[PDB]
Amino acid sequence: KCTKNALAQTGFNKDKYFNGDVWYVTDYLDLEPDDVPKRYCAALAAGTASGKLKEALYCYDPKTQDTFYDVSELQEESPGKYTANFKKVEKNGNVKVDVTSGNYYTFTVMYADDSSALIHTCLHKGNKDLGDLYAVLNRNKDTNAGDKVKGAVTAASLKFSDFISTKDNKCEYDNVSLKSLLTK
Ligand code: HEM
Ligand SMILES: NCCc1c[nH]cn1
């Protein structure tokens, strides 16, 4: 069961956040980890494409080098709070799992600035709730969480201590594919 009480950023600047460029996940807090050890890497891009708000996802597993992608049209619920009916796709946009009733995630932008952000997500897959996941984002992958986003972590009643860093986890990314998926 995810919480719905994550508060959107006051004065959220949606154009700066959804500018079509990549956000890297630098640190994350998964409140319901899979029983199997999975130290993944993730990044995302979001912005307008042919008049729609779109969000593409990338995940990388260093153990296998396996990759997975997703793309959604976003639906604004309220300011800074969105719902995404995802479809799983190859790096070229070919559909692996279609848009389905029980598959969706929601997110809230709790904090953001030109370079960083903190978001809450709640993922639903096959109708089941997979729990809360908080991500600290940055426009640069090797950048450490600065004071402002750490303040936002505190303001959300969390401890930065509990977060897991992707910094020396052998991550590799694919921003070209991630950006071009916005049109698919
Ligand atoms: C912005 C941050 C993230 C978002 C929006 C997000 C979103 C998603 C989505 C939509 C899926 C379902 C994919 C599909 O089946 O088509 C997924 C699966 C998964 N994600 Fe993430 N993810 C995020 C960050 C992360 C991070 C940092 C990790 C690292 C542990 C992670 C681990 C996983 C795992 C293990 C699964 C497979 C879950 C299952 O089917 O049981 N994700 N993610
Ligand atoms: N238990 C974490 C669910 C999740 C994975 N990705 C996004 N959310």
Swiss-Prot record:
Any one cellular-component term (Gene Ontology): extracellular region
Family matches, as SUPFAM superfamilies: Lipocalins
GO biological process, one term: vasodilation
Principal location class: secreted
Keywords attached to this entry: Disulfide bond, Heme, Iron, Metal-binding, Secreted, Signal, Vasoactive, Vasodilator
Protein residues bound to heme: C59
CDD domains listed in its UniProt record: lipocalin_NP1 (cd19455)
Pfam families: Nitrophorin
Disulfide cross-links: C2-C122, C41-C171
Subcellular location: Secreted
InterPro entries from the UniProt entry: Calycin, Nitrophorin, Nitrophorin_domain
Recorded family membership: Belongs to the calycin superfamily. Nitrophorin family.
Function recorded in the entry: Heme-based protein that deliver nitric oxide gas (NO) to the victim while feeding, resulting in vasodilation and inhibition of platelet aggregation. Reversibly binds nitric oxide (NO). Also binds tightly to histamine, which is released by the host to induce wound healing.
Name of the molecule in the record: Nitrophorin-1
